[PDB]
Design a protein around this ligand. Sequence first.
Ligand code: CLA
Ligand code: CLA
Ligand code: CLA
Ligand code: CLA
Ligand code: PQN
Ligand code: SF4
Ligand code: SF4
Lengths: 154, 143, 743, 31, 80, 93, 159
Amino acid sequence: DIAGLTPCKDSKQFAKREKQSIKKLESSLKLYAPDSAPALAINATIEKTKRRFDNYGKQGLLCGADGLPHLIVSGDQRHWGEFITPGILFLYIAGWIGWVGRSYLIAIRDDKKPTQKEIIIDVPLATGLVFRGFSWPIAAYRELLNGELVAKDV
Amino acid sequence: GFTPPELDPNTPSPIFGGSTGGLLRKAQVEEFYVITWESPKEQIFEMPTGGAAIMREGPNLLKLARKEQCLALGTRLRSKYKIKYQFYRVFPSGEVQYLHPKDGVYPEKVNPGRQGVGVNFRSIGKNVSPIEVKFTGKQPYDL
Amino acid sequence: PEVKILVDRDPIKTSFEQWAKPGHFSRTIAKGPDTTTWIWNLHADAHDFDSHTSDLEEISRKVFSAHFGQLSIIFLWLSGMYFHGARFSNYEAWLNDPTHIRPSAQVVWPIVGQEILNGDVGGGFRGIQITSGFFQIWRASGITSELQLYCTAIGALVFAALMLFAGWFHYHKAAPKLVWFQDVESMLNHHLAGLLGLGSLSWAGHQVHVSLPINQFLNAGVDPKEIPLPHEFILNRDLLAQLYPSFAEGATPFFTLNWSKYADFLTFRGGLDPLTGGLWLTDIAHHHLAIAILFLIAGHMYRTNWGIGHGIKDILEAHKGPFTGQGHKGLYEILTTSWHAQLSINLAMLGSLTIIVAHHMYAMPPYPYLATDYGTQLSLFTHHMWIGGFLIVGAAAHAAIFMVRDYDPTTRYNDLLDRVLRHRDAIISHLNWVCIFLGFHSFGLYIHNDTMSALGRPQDMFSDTAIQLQPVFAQWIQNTHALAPGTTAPGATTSTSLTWGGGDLVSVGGKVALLPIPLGTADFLVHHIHAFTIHVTVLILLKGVLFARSSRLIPDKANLGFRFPCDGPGRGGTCQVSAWDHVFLGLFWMYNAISVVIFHFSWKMQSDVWGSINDQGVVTHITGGNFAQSSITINGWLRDFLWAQASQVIQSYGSSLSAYGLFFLGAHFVWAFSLMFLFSGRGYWQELIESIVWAHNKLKVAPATQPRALSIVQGRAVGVTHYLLGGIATTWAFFLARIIAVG
Amino acid sequence: INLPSLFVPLVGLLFPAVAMASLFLHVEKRL
Amino acid sequence: SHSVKIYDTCIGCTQCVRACPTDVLEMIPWGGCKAKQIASAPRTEDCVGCKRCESACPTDFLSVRVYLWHETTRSMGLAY
Amino acid sequence: YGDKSVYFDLEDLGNTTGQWDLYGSDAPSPYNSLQSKFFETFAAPFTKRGLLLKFLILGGGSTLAYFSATASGDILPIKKGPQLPPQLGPRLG
Amino acid sequence: YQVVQPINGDPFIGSLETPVTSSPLVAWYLSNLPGYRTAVNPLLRGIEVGLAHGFLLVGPFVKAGPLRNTEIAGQAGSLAAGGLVVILSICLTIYGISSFNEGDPSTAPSLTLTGRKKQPDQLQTADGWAKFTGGFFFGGISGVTWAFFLLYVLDLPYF
Ligand code: CLA
Ligand code: CLA
Ligand code: CLA
Ligand code: CLA
Ligand SMILES: CC1=C(C/C=C(\C)CCC[C@H](C)CCC[C@H](C)CCCC(C)C)C(=O)c2ccccc2C1=O
Ligand code: SF4
Ligand code: SF4
């Protein structure tokens, strides 16, 4: 397949890794009471490990010669879940954060003692401002088009 | 025009116990300094080199190896106490040279008998580029 | 003249006014901030009370209540330890079988797979193996259930509450005044007799009734739950009479002066308990009894209110001779008006004490099942060494602060201080020469050994088989100690330790508690390395203290204050010419010294003492005496110690010791990170922040509190603190991972 | 007769001695 | 000998003069400001290059500048 | 200078600057004349700066050259040479 | 009563007067050394100094050398001392060459400890120093040879 990698569900090294992982935990479960707190905790993580391997298999990840799920970021549409849709989500959240911060800075820039509102947050103003980040992309686009995102005069 | 005071040897010096911060070979071969003050009373003062000494009621004359040490002692004498001081520089010749206060009034007080030395009639942002004084011995600031 | 309680009512009203205002104490801070530097200053001078004001009364009131706050923090920490031992521990399982179960009193929540840190510590328990040695303390105190630990945790919680309240009270409601603090005669009388005398008498009382019988029962093999509760040992006395027959007479021996009738549980045996691998409890009880008597008499020396006693001023000014003029006259006035003098004296003494504690605790293990718990031993020694070193450096810091801020010959003149200030140059020159000579003849020997070994000439090497440098004095002293019991300490049966000699190896559970420690050529070399490092750090700190006020370089260094960047690049360059900068170096050299000390300890112990005993009495040590032949060249330290011992931590990943591997790497990182602050200067950084600020201003996102690069002093402070954190943490990870895996 | 036996001491011992003595003499006094 | 220069932006505050350790600077009459005073440097052969004078200048940019130059034993502050 | 309390006088700067010699003897030659006449007659040709320096350098140089070019095997193992057959490298040799 | 006094009673010269620095016997001893024998021809002082230093250099070189176990230990170590003494002479001659000139007077002090005049010590001249270093080297090789003659050439019971 892409870059010579093979679908983990059909790979052999990916399975071997899963069985080996599951094997060692089972050993930790032994030498204790069969239904003890520690034993119950070990069981829980065994089931968790089995779920993680099956989830990896289901999502169609690519496995190399070591059986480790490699991530493709070239833009192939069979793999947007690996980098590009999480990337769009990140860009959204980071723009939210930055836009809210910038909005706040602009709003408090007009007092006489603006540093007072920086070492001691005006939380009412901040809570009024936080939710504009939800629409930050449209606001920023229209601010760029308006020409008011970038300060002229500098 | 303010004949400087002449150094008067036989003027006593503070009561000190001795120190390893005193004079060295440089005072023997190149120069040393001497400061004098007048002490309304006998008091304890911190030496600019070591511990504490006792200035005598009457003339006090102290020999230091550095001009900066002299000025430090002079400042301490002048504002912690209220004492007027003068210091000189002595060479291995036997020459003395009145140093401070040069023209009788402290330099923080403007006096009408002083000429300007090293004054540039322009703001610091109007010095020429170094390329303009390349291959001539001058420095762009000395201009 | 007479001594009384003297107070002031409601000096400052408790209120939330100043919480809203950041840096209320500093006039400049109170107003507000123009740049980022203001935030750093707010923290740097929070606890410098003697500069927020000039009144000694206010300084001392603040100091008193801050001490109360610190005591409260310590109590909260203790209660946390006890509660974790009560609730999230395997202390009872460990109590049933001490030398197979690994103590651990911390579990983790299964959040992101971190539950792998919940390793198998035995006892049907999965947690993080602790090295605090708390289980040994609790066992030596007689604690057998977790109900007792719960009660202890709650008691310490209410004590922390009491301490916090007292801190609030003695500052906002009833604050003492200056004449109350400036009374040191009664204060000493109470701390010697009341705090240490009554404290140790009270502890001896505890051990006589609780720890002695309960530990007797535990060492007899009784199941911990089948042991009588301690209060029974007080209610029913024949319970004690059975274990200790001479509890039958019951305090009439104490008044007939037939004290020999107490020889049962008040012994002078010395050595170790062959069953627990710790000191005899009947010896520790006797020890604390004698200590109590000594301190109780000693707290009666100084005169307070009834004529009898000693005036400290009289004692001081009675001591003077022909070499020192009027020495000690005027010290009482110095040590009662400046907190920094007292602080530096106490810090020096406390650091000395901490390091003495580390040595004595490694040599004479006081707790049962402590000696054969190698991880606990290593961690305790290392921790106390580090604490002691840091305290000793702080002593110098505050001596310098005193010299700069509070020394005044006009009003408070002392003769000795003046004389030392007057020949500081001779002092520093001779200390300089000693440092150089010691460095050549200790490390030079290592370099000679390395090249002699690399040139295939081992006969020429300074070793046990080529050119012997035997520490004949230490060998002679320790042979004198080995012969002591019976010859010159007739009342003792065993020598005070087992490192002296006499054979008499003691083991516990197939592991070696202690055996005679041999001193060869490698010991000579490394001891002189120790002397060298200690002398050099002393040189740095003493040079900082003696030259804090003035020098031949800058004649008015005191006017620049105790802490400052420089006085320009004049006279050739005066970078770090201040007293504070000298402390910054001393920390570097203290780090070096303590690091070498703990490496020496760890290698020597893993090579000549610790290890596993077997059926014939064949002792296989952790490393087969590889310290006597491999520690004499630096390649031996790099290969046999670091490279060899380092493998344990590197292979920690994938197991429960994985956190130690992670901390190893993270500490390497933060150490390397410190170098960015330690090699650069703030000019470059200010010029870079300039263009970053431009980038922000271009988008109307520049802050109003103008971002400045750190101060010159702050950059050095960030660089030294990160350096120390990195180095100490990587050593911590290495030691712990190695001794928990191989121990 | 073994050429290293002569040139390695002279270049390692003699030559630096001569050169450093001469260069100290040249650098450390006034003309 | 270091070289100290005074520029005409000097407001004649005299804080720098009160700062120098070696008495290099002085106050001299002038007419270009409201103090009728300006700083002179008639004794730069004693300047140690400490630049305390620059940290005391309240102008922007500075009106007193110290350019370090050839070193003397006076310039290096050596007592031996 | 040294008139009860004063210690400064322009006429005697050396006393003022402590230009003393704290340990010089100012005594006559303790060596007997006969002995002096034996040494300064035999050790004379070595008291010329350039002569002594040049002779020292070149004489010591040829000293070292001779003593190392003609050293025996029992003094330096570097000239005794190897005495064993050589091993082979990991693959080469 | 106080023991430490300022130098010659001058409290502004950078030194002090103590037992090690200025007690009777230690002053007499230091003054009776060739280096401080000011009124003596420099060559004889150099001889005495060179002979004492040369003899000393043989002691450690031989015993601590790499040929100590070998039978030529004495020959080897003594030769090493000869190499060292010659190097010291090279250090001395070039020092005298760099720091002195013939046409110049002695840099030694002219005053004694009491304030009396005295002839400046001739060892601090150019050819005074040259005579001294010549004597030193002659004495140094002679000392090494004397010490090297005592042991090995003659049994003579030591250690
Ligand atoms: C830059 C070139 C170079 C370098 C790095 C070396 C390095 C070395 N030579 Mg060598 N040599 C060279 C050129 C060089 N040689 C040339 C061109 C000749 C003539 C064909 C020789 C002839 C020679 C002999 C006979 C011997 C060595 C030996 C040695 C080794 C011992 C060190 C020594 O005694 O110095 C070198 C000794 C010399 C006599 C070299 C003199 C000839 C060169 C040109 C001198 C240049 C000096 C010049 C003014 C400074 C140049 C500036 C710069 C190098 C700093 C050493 C590894 C010895 C050996 O074999 O070790 C086992 C040995 O006996 N060399
Ligand atoms: C209002 C907040 C805010 C915003 C919108 C930006 C925006 C930007 N920064 Mg910046 N930055 C910030 C805060 C902010 N920064 C803070 C607090 C610091 C101190 C650590 C820095 C330090 C910094 C550096 C060193 C650099 C930037 C750079 C940049 C630019 C490139 C994006 C980037 O790499 O950022 C990087 C983001 C960081 C390094 C850390 C961000 C800190 C958090 C996430 C933001 C704080 C939000 C605020 C506290 C929330 C308050 C909201 C209110 C309701 C209370 C970009 C325009 C780069 C540049 O110059 O571009 C060419 C660059 O080199 N920033
Ligand atoms: C027998 C009397 C006595 C006792 C037991 C103590 C004990 C202590 N003093 Mg104290 N002191 C005393 C008398 C006493 N003092 C006198 C007469 C004076 C001078 C008038 C002082 C002045 C003084 C100062 C200035 C300071 C201390 C400090 C301390 C603490 C030192 C830190 C420590 O070791 O932690 C050990 C911890 C414990 C022993 C835990 C138990 C704590 C117990 C409950 C303390 C109770 C003793 C107290 C005096 C009770 C009287 C108050 C009462 C009205 C409630 C310690 C608890 C330091 C401090 O305040 O720390 C906050 C300190 O700054 N003392
Ligand atoms: C009883 C012990 C003691 C006491 C009471 C004091 C008290 C004081 N010291 Mg001091 N000192 C001590 C010991 C002590 N010291 C020791 C052992 C050292 C050697 C390191 C020093 C070295 C020292 C210096 C160099 C200085 C002081 C200074 C001061 C004064 C101000 C401190 C301050 O507010 O800074 C603020 C406190 C902080 C900013 C805390 C910093 C946080 C540390 C560095 C990080 C620790 C990391 C942590 C342990 C683990 C990492 C956590 C992280 C990963 C989350 C103050 C009166 C300062 C002074 O000017 O005196 C007037 C001064 O500069 N001390
Ligand atoms: C890196 C470095 C700096 C720059 C270091 C800085 C600017 C410290 C940075 C502190 C943090 C990273 C910035 C403050 C962050 C705010 C608290 C905002 C945080 C809000 C969220 C991101 C948590 C110096 O100033 C310096 C000075 C002298 C010698 C060496 C150096 C040096 O090495
Ligand atoms: S560099 Fe120093 S000495 Fe020179 S003028 Fe400036 S402050 Fe004065
Ligand atoms: S501080 Fe600056 S502006 Fe003020 S007098 Fe001095 S040189 Fe002029």
